[PDB]
Design a protein around this ligand. Sequence first.
Ligand SMILES: */C(C)=C\C(=O)Nc1ccc2nc(NCCCCCN(C)C)nc(NCCCCCCN(C)C)c2c1
Length: 213
Amino acid sequence: ENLYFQGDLIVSMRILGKKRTKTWHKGTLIAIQTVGPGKKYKVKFDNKGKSLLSGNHIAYDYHPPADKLYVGSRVVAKYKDGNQVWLYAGIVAETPNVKNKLRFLIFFDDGYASYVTQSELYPICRPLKKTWEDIEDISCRDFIEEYVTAYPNRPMVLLKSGQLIKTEWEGTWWKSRVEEVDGSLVRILFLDDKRCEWIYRGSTRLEPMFSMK
Ligand SMILES: */C(C)=C\C(=O)Nc1ccc2nc(NCCCCCN(C)C)nc(NCCCCCCN(C)C)c2c1
């Protein structure tokens, strides 16, 4: 069945859609449909390519108002590396507070964690009732369910600058060093190659956390 609007969505609105690359891109909502229990949203991306998307695979082209997001909220966030930016789906792990210097903590669908500001976020239009249930990587899905279900119970390890620990990376444990702590994240330096990473302090990739998981 055809629809020309659906709640707060209207045909011809600007929107973000999830492309086949798993990154999100700006476009225009050109059609809406409802077929039995399922709604889909036809998006024309700015390159004129089109995709028929479920409501959890579109996001508003605006930033969340204050107090609209909560822990567990399904969002698209900017991920920055060098001079590049990607829009990528994730879950709000923390909302702005004194402890995190008024930032949102995002757990991206691929497992990376990052503090971001409101200008770096977009709410997903129609998240699943259990927001984690569209996380494609089942290990990430299971982690998010665990995290959100326990919250605010959050087992984390206390780490200090200079501390030497082993950190897991792709199936091996590596000699590493705590370079700095930022709220619920720690920046770990791998001593073998001097590559570093921001990791959640409740991650089982940190040896002390693994041991007590
Ligand atoms: C440290 C002092 C500097 C450093 O290494 N910086 C650095 C800069 C940029 C980085 N980008 C990434 N990207 C990984 C993919 C992220 C995808 C995010 N999605 C949301 C789209 N990663 C790192 N570091 C990762 C850790 C690498 C550790 C290697 C350990 N060896 C033992 C193999 C990164 C780091």
